[PDB]
Amino acid sequence: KTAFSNVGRKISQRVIHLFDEKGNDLGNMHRANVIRLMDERDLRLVQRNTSTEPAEYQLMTGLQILQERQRLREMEKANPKTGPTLRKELILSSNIGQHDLDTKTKQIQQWIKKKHLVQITIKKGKNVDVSENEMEEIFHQILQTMPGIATFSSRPQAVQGGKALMCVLRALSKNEEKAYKETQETQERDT
RNA sequence: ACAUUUAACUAAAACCCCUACGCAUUUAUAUAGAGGAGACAAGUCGUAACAUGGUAAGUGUACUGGAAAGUGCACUUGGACGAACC
Ligand SMILES: [K+]
Ligand SMILES: [K+]
Ligand SMILES: [K+]
Ligand SMILES: [Mg+2]
Ligand SMILES: [Mg+2]
Ligand SMILES: [Mg+2]
Ligand SMILES: [Mg+2]
């Protein structure tokens, strides 16, 4: 996390693009001169933008820093930003028992409702001879319990030297969800 | 409920009742279906226990969880704390 607080007296860069407490642009100056300004006016230094090639810092009072920090949290409370998608992994065996496959199927369903990406890998069972067409059937068994909830983000694909398959499931988008409801309703009208 | 009659110059005859047992009661067997334990064995998912077993273990109780189990509170040592001062 990047907090909006006083940077302190030790500045990271040597050349600093400084601004005034009222927003007036003071141009670039050496950090030694900035510390002198902070002491002469009794102000604190905050970092407004870092993407710019010349580091942009601004002088502010303790009251301004509070007002900005309050403004930012209200912007998020009102317009909360979405977080990055978390990737969950599962490694199954070809000869996985049905009771255990049901346990992991219920777990995959809970990850999809939370809008996660589920990477499912299927390896050849121990002391078992299996074909890639039979291992690929487990994916459809898993995804069949989630008719209009999940779909393939990355279809089954041999990996690890052809020993194991791998796919990535995701939650259906809102447009894809309304389409499923539409197609389902059409079948209801036909039947 | 039933109630002793005849007979008696030797003495004898006569006497014969009706109500219970059931859709009651006792115990057991059979049978739809639902569970438990054990044996055989060691597939499947984990790795709970045994070493400070990788969060010391356990008891009671409560709640919770695919599964061993997890967690709270009190209790136990059937754990330990390295055994002069440093
Ligand atoms: K334990
Ligand atoms: K122990
Ligand atoms: K207990
Ligand atoms: Mg263990
Ligand atoms: Mg332990
Ligand atoms: Mg305990
Ligand atoms: Mg818990």
UniProtKB/Swiss-Prot annotation:
Alphabetical UniProt keywords: Initiation factor, Mitochondrion, Protein biosynthesis, Transit peptide
GO CC field: mitochondrion
Keyword Disulfide bond part of the UniProt annotation: no
Main location: mitochondrion
Compartment(s): Mitochondrion
Gene Ontology BP term (one): mitochondrial translational initiation
Domain of life: Eukaryota
Gene Ontology MF, one: translation initiation factor activity
Similarity section: Belongs to the IF-3 family.
Role this protein plays: IF-3 binds to the 28S ribosomal subunit and shifts the equilibrium between 55S ribosomes and their 39S and 28S subunits in favor of the free subunits, thus enhancing the availability of 28S subunits on which protein synthesis initiation begins.
Name of this protein: Translation initiation factor IF-3, mitochondrial
Organism of provenance: Homo sapiens
Upper taxonomic lineage: Eukaryota, Metazoa, Chordata, Craniata, Vertebrata
